[PDB]
Amino acid sequence: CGSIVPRREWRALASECRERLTRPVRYVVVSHTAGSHCDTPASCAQQAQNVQSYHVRNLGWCDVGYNFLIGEDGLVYEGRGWNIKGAHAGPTWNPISIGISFMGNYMNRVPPPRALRAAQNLLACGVALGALRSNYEVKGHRDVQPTLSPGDRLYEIIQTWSHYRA
Amino acid sequence: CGSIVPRREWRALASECRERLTRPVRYVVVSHTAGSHCDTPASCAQQAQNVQSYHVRNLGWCDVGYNFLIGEDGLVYEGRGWNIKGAHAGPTWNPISIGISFMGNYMNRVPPPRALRAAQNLLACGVALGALRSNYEVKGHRDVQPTLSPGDRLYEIIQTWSHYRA
Ligand SMILES: [Cl-]
């Protein structure tokens, strides 16, 4: 499901994280990377590489912090996946959430419809696989942490999603 | 289920097809367009437009002949959809099948894994929706019509699919 781009396909470094999420997960936190935007499979694969590079080598993390990344190419990029706890929303929310991050800065841009489609489809695939609860709740990154993420315009959109709860 | 680029998004001309398929459909016929390939959302949306233009304007069909198109950008493009009979495999197979076409020429190229993923994912959602049978069968275009489509290399791959039946 999701036609998710797997780790090796975007040339990811090997994970070394061990902490597992306890399925089914009840929460989904939507962020933005506040990094560069990308609109092709080649450029978004490079961008997921860059995001992981910063988390791995500079911040010293066991892997890219997000469970999944959404490109403006309309594709979902595998981060830590469904079963591995992320590092994207702080110690309160990391073990009870799935963190999906839109690659870009969305204070003054909206992501394209195909990016939003990929995100909602990804969440449906998480329900189908048992990784998410049927009644999962979507939160903005700014609703759980002091941050402008996921950006004003993207935040406006996710507030209209049927599973969003402030 | 599934993420599909809708007709209006790739700026399709309005369909005038009326004849319906009978759910659930038993057969899926995999073609290639034998035309240009594309690996970005912008270029693949244009390519779906070009394919439809040739079918509608030159061949005089009611819409693009394919039920769905697959781009090398990794996205699925809505053709006639799940419920409308296509024009892709001749009068014997058109009324009993779903026609999916990889946009490109795959005599000497393989489609990228993300294109293959998009096609397999699309068929799974067809089953989930009830548009396809649980036990649908995948055929190559050359298995039902005299043609090189879907191309030697693509044909080699679909023969390895679990629902393939020569
Ligand atoms: Cl970490």
Provide tags for this entry.
alpha/beta, five-stranded mixed beta sheet, 166 residues, binds chloride ion, 17% strand, 27% helix
Question: What does this protein structure show overall?
Answer:
Chains A, B: InterPro entries: Amidase/PGRP_sf (IPR036505), Amidase_domain (IPR002502), Peptidoglycan_recognition (IPR017331), PGRP (IPR015510), PGRP_domain_met/bac (IPR006619). Chains A, B: GO terms for molecular function: N-acetylmuramoyl-L-alanine amidase activity; peptidoglycan binding; peptidoglycan immune receptor activity; zinc ion binding. Chains A, B: Its main location: secreted. Two copies of one chain form a homodimer. By secondary structure, chain A is α/β, with parallel strands linked by helices. Chain A is 27% helix and 17% strand. The longest helix of chain A has 18 residues, at 41-58. The two termini of chain A are 28 Å apart. Chain A has a five-stranded mixed beta sheet, covered by helices on one side. In chain A, a hairpin with a 5-residue loop joins strand 2 and strand 3 (76-78). Chain A is built from four helices and five strands; from the N terminus they run βαββαβαβα. Chain A has helices spanning 41-58, 90-93, 113-128, 152-158, and strands spanning 25-32, 68-70, 76-78, 97-102, 132-140. Chain A is globular, with a radius of gyration of 14 Å. Chain A has one domain. The A-B interface holds A 1-5, 9, 39-42, 73-75, 112-114, 117-118, 120-121, 124 and B 1-5, 9, 39-42, 73-75, 112-114, 117-118, 121, 124. Bound molecules: chloride ion. Residues 61-62, 87 of chain A line the site of chloride ion.
